[model samples]
Target: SSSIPMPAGVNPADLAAELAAVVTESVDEDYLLYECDGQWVLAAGVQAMVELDSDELRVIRDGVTRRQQWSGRPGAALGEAVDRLLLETDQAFGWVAFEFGVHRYGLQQRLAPHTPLARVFSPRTRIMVSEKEIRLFDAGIRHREAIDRLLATGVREVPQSRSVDVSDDPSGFRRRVAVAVDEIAAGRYHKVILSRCVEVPFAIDFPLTYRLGRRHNTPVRSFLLQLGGIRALGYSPELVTAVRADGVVITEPLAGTRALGRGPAIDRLARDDLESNSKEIVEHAISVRSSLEEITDIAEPGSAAVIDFMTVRERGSVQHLGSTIRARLDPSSDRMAALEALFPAVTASGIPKAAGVEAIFRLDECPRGLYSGAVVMLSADGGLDAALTLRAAYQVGGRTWLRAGAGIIEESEPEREFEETCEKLSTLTPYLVAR
Candidate 1:
C-alpha cells in the first residue's frame, strides 16, 4: 500500500465532494466512490472500469469500476490487481461496487442495470475516522494538494429543488398486491416481494441527495455511488450480507413494517404493534429463519443462528421487525457462495425467493432495477457490506427512479398494503413535495 500522511482537520466526505469535479475531469467517466460521515475511497483519475460477468473479455481493466455488478448478486470482497493502493488512515479502500438482490444472474428477464456487474476502481485517496482523529491516506494522489484543493473548491453548485412522478398508482399497485397474495395463497410460493418504481423525472444532485438521506433516514449502509453515466443514492435500512475481516458473515433482514407518526404515545403503540402482531410475527419468523438457513449449511457446523431475534427496530422512514444473523464461514466457503444462502433477501423477495421473483415479474409491469437490489462495497481483505436498495433512488441522466416494496402474505389486505407502500413512499416526499 502506498501510504501517505496528511495534515489534521480534514473531513473525508467534504474532501470527496470537493474533489468530485476534479477527479471526474480525467478519470471522470468511471468514478468509483464510497464516503460516508466516516470511511471514504476515491479515484486519482479514470484508469479503467472492471466489468464483471461480461460476455466479452470480462474485465474492466483500469482506475475505478463504479457501481459494477459481481456474480449477478450481492456478495463480499475478492480483490483484483488494481486494488494495489494506499492505506494509512485506518480504511482499506479498494474495489467498491454496487448490486441489488434483483441484479442476480439467474434471471430470465434480466434486471436492467445502469452499469455492469462491477465498477472496479482503486482509490489513491482514502480516509477513516477514529475516536478523536480524522485521518487521511494518499496513494497515487498527494494529500497536501487534495486538501488545499478542498479548501479552494468548498461546496459545489446544486439544484434548487427536486420533484417526483409516481409510476405505479395506488389502485394498480393494490391490484398487483391482491394478485401476489392470491399467488401466495395458491401455494405458488410461501411469500413474495412486490415492488413499485417512482420516476423523479430529472437528474438530481447526488451529493445533495445523499446529504438529505443522511439527515432524513436511518440506513444500515447509506451509499452515494456514481455509475454508468448516472448516480445511485440510497438510505437502505436492510443489510444484505457483511463479511468482516475476521471471516465472520452477518445478515440483517427487516420484515413487518409500520408507519411512524409523531408523539410519544402513538409512536409507542405503533412500535409495540409491529413487535407483537401475529401476522407480522409469522412474516418476521420466515425472514429470520430463512436468514439462518442461508448460513447454517455453509456456516461452520453449528456456527449459525439468530444472534438477535425479532426486535422492533425503528428507522426515520418506518418501523419493522428486524433480526440479525451471524455466521462463521467454512474454510472452503467463498464470499459469493456463502452469500447464496441469502441473496434476494428473503424479507425483500419472500420466503422462497424464486417464487417471489416469479410472482413479482409476472404481476408487476415495470422493471425493479436496483430498487430491490443492494449497493455492495468490498475491500481487498474479505471486508464486505451490502445495503438493500429498498428505499433508494437512481438517476439516469435526465431521469431518476425511486422505488419501495411491501412484503406479502395470505392475510395482507390490498387497501392496507397500498397504504403501506404509500407510507414507505412518504419518506421521500419531503424532498419531492417542493420547498
Candidate 2:
C-alpha cells in the first residue's frame, strides 16, 4: 500500500489545512507536491470544481483563486491561502498554482536532495476542478484531438468575414486613450493594458483550435498549458508579481508593435521600426518609465532596471504589442494588493486608466475573460510568478473561443488595425484553420 494518505472530502479549503498540518509536523521540507483538475464552469463569470491529482490527499487551501477574474479579489484569496500555509507549517516547500478561468494553470515545486515524495503526479493527469463541479475527462484531449475529429466528422466550414467597426466619431476612443495615458502620468498604476475587440466568425472553429495549438507549441517565456474540457494557450514573457523567500517582485514593461518576416532582414526591419517610430517609442517610453517608478516606490531602489529591448517569438503572428518590467521586494509586503492595483497594465490600457478601459468597453463587445488579466503561480519554495493573460483562448462546455485585439492610438488607422488583428489571430493558424 502507498504510504501517501488520501482525504475523504473534496473541499479544497479543508484539504489545504490538513496538508499544511502534515508539512508542519514532517521533517522533510524540500518538496511539497499536489495536483488538481483545471476545468471551470462559465456562467455569467465563472463557476468551477476542484479536481485533485491525488485522491488520497485533499487540497486544504483555496488554490482555485489562481483564475484571473475582472476583479482582483480572486488573487487576494490565493495569496492569503499561501500565507496561512507557510505560517502553519513553519517550513518552506515548492508550491503549485492552477485555475480554470481562461483555461490557465501551472505546477511549481521545489526539488531538494533526498526528498521522499518524487513523481507525485503526472502532468497529463491534472484535471480541471471547481467548487461547483468536477470534470474528470482530460480537457487537453479535446483540444489536441477531439476538435480535429469533429471537423473531420462531416462538420462544414462556414465562411465568415473578419472586421472591426469603430464609429466615425473618434472623440470617444481618443478621450479614453488620453485618460489612460493621464493615469500613468499621475502615477495611478505602473501599467494598464486595454484592448479593442474585433470579432471574426470562422467557417468552422478549426481556426480557433489552430490558433490555440500554435500558442501552446510556441509559448512566451512564461508558458502555461491546461488540458481537458478547457484549454488556454499563451506565451506571456512579463512578470507582474513573484515571491521568493522573504522577497516579492513586480514587473511591467510596455511593448510597441511592428511586423516580423520569415528572414533575418524582415525581423531586423520590424525591430528597427519599433525602435525608430516616434509613436511606438513614445508608447513604450511611458510604460517603461511608469514601471520603473512603481518598482522604486515599493521595492528596493537598487533592484529595478529598465530593459527597453527584448525579443519574443511564437510560431505564428507577432501583431500584438507587449513589454516586461520586473522588481524584487521583501516577501512581507502585500503582494496580492500590489497586483490588484496594477490591473490593466498601462501598455494595454493606454495612458489614462479609466478612460482607456471605458473606451475599450464601448468600442469592443467581447468579454475579455482572462485574456488581459494575470495568470499567477505559487511555487512550493515560497516563490511565485505571474504572467499577463495575453495570447490565449478558452475551451468551455465543448466550445472554444479565441480573442485578438490591438491598441488604437491617435495615429491609428482603422484598416491597418483590422489587418493587425488578423495577424494576431494568425498565431493559431495551424491548429485552427489548417486544412
Candidate 3:
C-alpha cells in the first residue's frame, strides 16, 4: 500500500530545500529529487539498484549482487527487472545515459566498455510534497526521525549568485555545424544535433546551484540527483516520453529555439519570427512527423495523433516551437517498448534517429554521458516519465561542466546554431554556485 499524506504545515519549497541539504550532506545515501507535473518526489537511500549495460542487467541490494542477467536486448531486460523491483518498493527513480541508444539502434560495437547506460533504484524512503501536504513512506521508517528534525530547523540560506563565463571555442562548434550541414546536403541524413561542452574551472555546489537555478527558470520538469557517481541538477525543457497507467503514452517535442528574456516586446517579436521562419517550420514539422511515426509503431492503429502543434513555449532563457503528440499503446506492447521506441528524443537526436546517432558519434569529440539523456521515474502502478536532460549542469569524477546543443538542418546557419546553444546554456550558467 502507498503511504498516506499528512498536512505539511510548512512550505513546499522548504521541503525541497531540506531534501537538497540531505542529499548534499549525507555521507553514504544516494538521492533523487524530481519535480514533474507540479508534484515534488524525493527518493532517498537506495533499497535496491537496477543498472543496465548494452547487453546486461544487474541488481544490487545491501551492497551485494542480488541478481544479474545478460541478453541481446538489454532494454527489454531492464524493463522486466525494474517491474519486478517496483513490486517490492512501490516506486523507483533513475536516469538513462545517451549511450543507452546503442542497444536500440544496434550500435553496441561503438560503445565503450563500462560506459554508463542506465541506473534505476528503489528508495528506502520516499517523501512526496505538493501544495499543502507531504506523504512519507518507508518500510522501516528509519529516516523519518532525522527528516523531521531537518524540517523543524527550517530553510537554509540561498546560495549567492556568481557570474561564470560559459563560453567555449566558437570556431570548433561552428565548424562542426558547417560540416553537419554539408553532410545533410549530401543526403547522409536530414538533420543531426551536434553538442559542445563548456567546462567550469572550479568545484560546484550542485544542490545549491539547483536551488539558485530553479528560481530563475520555467521548465516542464526539474531534477537534482547524486547517484552512481554522477551528480546533475537542471531545468528540463521537454518530456522524452510519459506513460500513463492506462496505456496512454505522450511525447512533447521542442525544436526551433530563440533566446528570450529580452524585453517583452522583443521577446514577442522573436516568437513571431520563429513561427514565420521557413527553416524553423521545416525543422519542427519534420520533428513532429518523426514523433508521430515512432508512436504509431507501438500505438493502436488509428490511435496516434497530434494533440497540439506549432505552439511557442518559453523555457528559461530560451523559447522553442513545440508540439504535443499522444497515443494509446497496442495491447501487445508495453511501457518499455514505448520507451525503447522513443529513447533519445527527436529534438535531441535528429530526423532519422539511427543516422542522427551515428552523426553525434562522428561529430562530438566526447561521450555525451547524461547531457542529452533522460531523468526517469517509474511507479509500481505501471507509469513512467522521462524528462529530457538539457539546460543543466553536471559533475562527474573531478570535472564540472555544462553542455547544450542545436538541431542542424541543410538550411541552418553555423553562426546562428552556435548562438542557440548560448541561449540554452544561459539558463544555468549565471546561476551556478561555487563550492
Candidate 4:
C-alpha cells in the first residue's frame, strides 16, 4: 500500500512544508517532499512504497497513456538545467534528480543534512522563491473529457524491424578500456565511469512509441511516454538508496542477467539458470559487501541477499537480474553524509573502485550522463530515497537518446557482452518509437 493517499485541495507548497515538518518531527531527520503527477508525497524510514504493477495496470487500461504521464515533463528538462545549475550555483544539493520516459520528464532539487521544509514541485508550477509560493494545476478535470476522447482511439502498436544491428567493434572497445585502466593505474580520481548512448529509430510517432513502451515494460532506469513530441516517465528500479531517521541504506549491485519469459515454466528456468551461476553470485555479493563497508555502523542490518530479483520486459526482449539489495539504516546516523558517499554505487561501477571504473571507461564509448547517476527525491523532512538511473533515455531539444552498458570482467565474452547491452537498451524502445 502507498503512504500517499489522495490529497484534497490543499496548497502543494504548504503541504510540502508541513509534510517535511511531520517527517522531521516523527523521525528526527530530514525528508524529501515530491509532488509527482500533481500529488504531494513524502519518504522516510526506508518504508516500502507500493511497487506499481505497471504491467498489470497497463494491461487493464489496454495500454492507454494517462494524463499523469505528462506531469514530469518539465522536470526531465530541469535535470539537465539543474546539472548546469550545480556547476554555476556552487549550491549542489546532496543529489540532483530527474525522471524521463515516453510521457514524463522532471527534475528534483534536494538539500543536504536533511532539513525540514524540503520542498519539491514541478517546473510547470509557478514557484515563487521570494514568497515560498507553490500553485498546482487541478488534475485537468476540466479537460478530462477531451483527454479521454483523445485516448478513446485506443493505444497503437509501434512498428518493429525483423533484424537490427547494434554490434560495435570489440577491438576498439577493448583498447579504450585498456587506456582507462592505465589512467587508473596513474591515480586519477578513485573512479571515472563513462557510458555511450544508442538511438534505435522506429518508423512511428510519439504516441505509438509510448504504447509500445507500455506493452514492452523494459527495465531501463527512466521509462518515458512520448506524446506531442514530449517525453514523460518514471524511475524504474535499478539502483536505489533510502535514508531514514535511524540509518542509511543503498541498493546498487546488479551484475548477473537473464530474461523473464512469457510462461511460468520459462520464468522458473531463467531464475534457476541465473541463481546456479557462481560467477553471477560472486558479482552480486561483492556489490553488497562494498555498500556495507561504506555505511558500517548500522545495527540489525538486512539485505536482499540472493533472494531478490528484478524482472523487466522490453520490446523484443526481457531481462532478469539477480541480487537486489534492500538494507536498512540505524535510525540515528547522519543520513546526508551516508547518501552523498554512496553515489556511483559499486554495482554500477565495480569492486576495488579505481580498477572497475578505469576498466569501464577504457572499454565503453557511452557518455554516462544521468544514465547511471541517481534519480532521487528528498522529503521536506530530512528523509531521502533515490534509484539508480539505468534502462533510461533522454529527450533534449527534440532529440531522444537511450543508453545501456554491462559489467565486463575478464570472464566476460565480447559478443555476449555486446548483446547484454542491447538487451538492456530494449527497455527504452517503447518510449522512443512513434505512436
Candidate 5:
C-alpha cells in the first residue's frame, strides 16, 4: 500500500491532461477509469486483469464461496486497497449484469460468468499520472519500462469520442404489457414489470457521455464495467440494497411513476397523480412490502421498518415514488445472502418474484441479460451496493442495446404503459451513447 503526498498546490484540469493517455489503451484491455472529482474521487489503471473459471463462478453464485477465490489473487487483492484510496481518501472506481443470478434456478445457465467474473490486476505497474508527479506498483510487466517510456515521452493523446444512433420502438413492449395487464387482473400477480430493448450501431465515448449524464441525473449509484467484451455504463437513480461495512442494511426501492417539471405546481400535480392513482400506490406498496419480507428472512424477527415511506423523487428524466427500507443483517448470514434474495427486485420482477420471472420468461422474447438484474459490487470490507440496471445501455461487438422496464399492474393501461415506457427511455437514451 502507498500514497502520493501533495502540497495541495496541483491543478486538477492540467492533471486531467497529463492523465489523458490512460484513455487510449482502455478500449482493448480490461481497465476501469472512474473519475468524478471531489466526491467523484478518481482512479485510472490499465493493470493486467485475470478472471476465474466455473467453480469460482458457482462460489460467487452460492454467496457462501470462499474468499480465496477473490481475496488472495494479486489483481483482486489490490482492488480493495484501491477502493480504500477512493472512498477513504480520494480515488474513485466502479458492478454489473442481470441474469447472472439465474444459475441458482436451474433455468439453464442463460448467463454465466464471461472470461473474467472478477479481475486481479497485479498492475504490471500502477500508473499514477499527476499534475506534476506520477508512480506505479510494478516495474513493468509488459512495457519495456513503458510507464517510464510513456510518461517521459509524448504519445499521450486521448481517444476520439464515437456517437451512436438511437431508436425506441415500443410495439413489442406494449404488446407484452397488454398481455401482462390481463394476467395481473386475473390474480396471477398483482404487479409484473416488463421491459424493452433499443438497438444501437456503435461503441461509445464512455467518459464524455457519463459525465454528461451526471449533470442530468445525479445517480444514487453510478457505474462503468469492462468485463471481457461486455461494457456497461449508466447512472441508476434507485438502489436495490446497500450493506455498510458495519452491518447496517439499506434498500431504497423505487416504484410508481409520473413526469417531472418546474415549480411547486408541477411537483404537486405529479405527487397527487402518483398517490391518488390506486394502481401506482398498489404497485409502490407491493414493492416496499416485498423488500421487507426479504429482510424478514434474514433480519431479526420484526426488525425491518420503513424509515422513509412512499415519497416522490424526481430523477431527472422522470419522477418515481420511492421509499427506504432499513434492517439489521442476520449475524448468521453474510451480505451476499441478502443481495441474492432481493434480486430481479420486486419492482423489476413483480409482486411475486418467481411468478414475475416465469412470466417475463414466457412473455418477453429477448434475453433480458442484466436487464432484469442489478449491477452489483461487493467490497473487500464486506460492504455491498447495487444499482438497479434500469435506464442503461450495453454493447456486443458493434451493436449497442438500451434497456428499460415498467411495472404493469391490474389497472395498467397498455397504451399509457407504452407511453410510460417511452418516458423512461427519454430519461437516458439520448445522453447514454454519443449523440
Candidate 6:
C-alpha cells in the first residue's frame, strides 16, 4: 500500500466519485465503492472472481473459467472455498442475492433460474480515499496515471436531477400484504416481509444518484457496484451481520417504521408514535427475538445476548425501532455458519424464517433477486461485514427499478403496510439523476 496526501482544495468524496466516472468512461471495468462507518474503499478491475451457483463453483482468472461441482450444503461449500482463497489473497468484496437464502433454508428447489447465488472477487486495484490521503493497493501503471490526472483535474459541473413517480401504487402491494396477513393469522408464520418494485421510466446516472442520495440520507452503511451483471447502489439502514477476527459477531435489526424527513417537531412526534404504538413494538420485539435466536444457535454457550434494544434510528426519510444483538462465536462454528443462520435479516424476512420464505415466494409478484440480499466484504484477517440490501436502486438487463419491503405481523393492516413501503421508498426516489 502507498499513500499520497491530499492536495489543497481536494475533497475525498468528490475525488472518489470523479475517479469512479473516469474508470467507467475510460477503462470500462467492474468496480465497487463501499462506505462503512466513515471509511470509503473503491475496488476496481477484477484480479480474480469466485462465483457460487446452485451446484457448482466457478473461479475466473485471466479471462479463463474453471468450474467445480459440489453437493450437500451450498453455503458450507461457498464458505470453505472463499476461506481458502482469502488465505491466499488478502481482500475480496462481493454480494449474495436474497435467493441464496432459499438454499440455506432448504428451499433451493424454489430458487429462481439463472441466478448465481454469490460472487466475490479480488480486485486488481483497491483505493482508499479519505480526508487525510489517498491510499492505493495493487494498482497498475495505468490506474496510477489515471489517479494522478484526477488529482490534477478541475471540478466538473453537476448534472440536473430528474423527478420520477415514487408514489406507491397501493393495489398490488396491498393485495400481497393481505395475503401475508392471512398467512400470519392462519399460523403459517408469525410475520412476513412483502416487497414492491417501482420501475424507473427514464435512464439513471447511477454514480450521480449514489452521490446525491448519500447526501440526502443518513444510512449506517452505503455501497455502489457494477459486478456479476448486477448494477446497484444502496444506503443500508442496518447490517445483516458483522464478524470480527476475534470471533465476535453482531447483527443490527431495524423493524418498526415511521416517516421522517419532516420538520424536527413532526419527526420527533413520529418517533414517539413508533415507540409507543403496540403493534410496532410487537413487531420490533419479535424481530429482536428472532435475531437473538439465530445468534444463539451459532454462538458459544451463554455468549449470545441483545446488546441494545428498542432504540429509534433515523434512516434517511424514515425512522425505525432498532436493536443490536451480539455473541461470541463458537470455536466449532465458522463465519459461514453464522451467516447461514441469519442470512436474511429477521426484519427483512419474518419470525419463522422458513415459513416466511415460503410466503414470500408465493406472495411477492416476482423473484427478489438482490433486492433483500447483502453486499459483503471479507478481509484476510478473518473479518466479515454484510450490509442488508434495502433502500436501493438497481439496474440489470436493460431495466432499472427500486424496491422496498415492509414487515407484516398478525395485526398488520394492508393499507398501513403499503404506506410503510412508501415511507421507505422515499429514501432514494427523489435523488435519481437522469441520463
| Prediction RMSDs, each to the true structure | 5.0, 14.6, 2.2, 14.7, 7.1, 1.6
List candidate 4 stretches off by more than 4 Å: 1-164, 168-195, 201-208, 218-235, 244-252, 262-267, 297-318, 324-335, 358-363, 430-432
For model 2, what is the alpha-carbon lDDT of residue 63?
A: 39
CA lDDT of every candidate: 0.60, 0.41, 0.83, 0.42, 0.58, 0.84
lDDT of 4 by residue, 118-223 (tens): 1122221111111233322222233223323322432223466223345554335444444554555565533333345654443434333433454455333322
Which parts of model 1 are misplaced by more than 4 Å? Answer: 1-29, 33-48, 53-57, 62-118, 127-134, 139-146, 152-171, 365-367, 432-435
Worst 10 residues of 5 by lDDT: 54-63
Could you tell me how far off, in angstroms, the CA of residue 304 lies in candidate 3 after the best superposition? Answer: 0.4
In the range 1-435, model 1's lDDT, one tens digit per residue, is 433343355444544544554555444444445543355555343334444432211333343334433443233323432243212122232222222333443553454534343444444454443223435555344544654565565555444456554535843778888887887788888877776767665556666665554556666666666655656666678777887878898899888888874567888989988877888988788778777877775688888978888887777768888899999988887666565566667777776766676676677654554666556655656666666766766777577667777877888887787678767876665553221
lDDT of 4 at 261: 39
Model 2, position 381: C-alpha lDDT score? 55
RMSD of 5: 7.1
Which 10-residue window in model 4 sums to the lowest lDDT? 50-59
Candidate 2 regions with alpha-carbon error over 4 angstroms: 1-75, 82-218, 222-229, 246-252, 307-316, 319-324, 330-332, 433-435
Error of 4 at 435 (Å): 6.8
Residue range 1-435, candidate 5, lDDT tens digits? 343432254443223323333433532344443323222222334332323332342222112433344322222333434444334322222343345333333443443344223332222223443444444434334432443344355432233444333334544877788899889878887777887777766556554455555556746765555544766666677778777788878888899888764456886787788878887777678788888987776676667899998888778768888899988888986665666567657777776766777687777754565565565544556666667777776776787777677788877777777677766776665565353
Distance (Å) between predicted and true CA of 220, model 1? 1.3
Error of 4 at 378 (Å): 2.4
lDDT of 5 at 28: 38
Off by over 4 Å in 3: 1-11, 23-27, 66-69, 139-142
- Give the number of the best model, judged by TM-score: 6
Worst 10 residues of 6 by lDDT: 162-171
- Give residue 331's error in model 6 in angstroms: 0.5
**Distance from true position, residue 174, model 1, in Å?**
1.8
- What's the residue-level lDDT of 322 in candidate 2? 47
Best-fitting candidate, scored by lDDT: 6
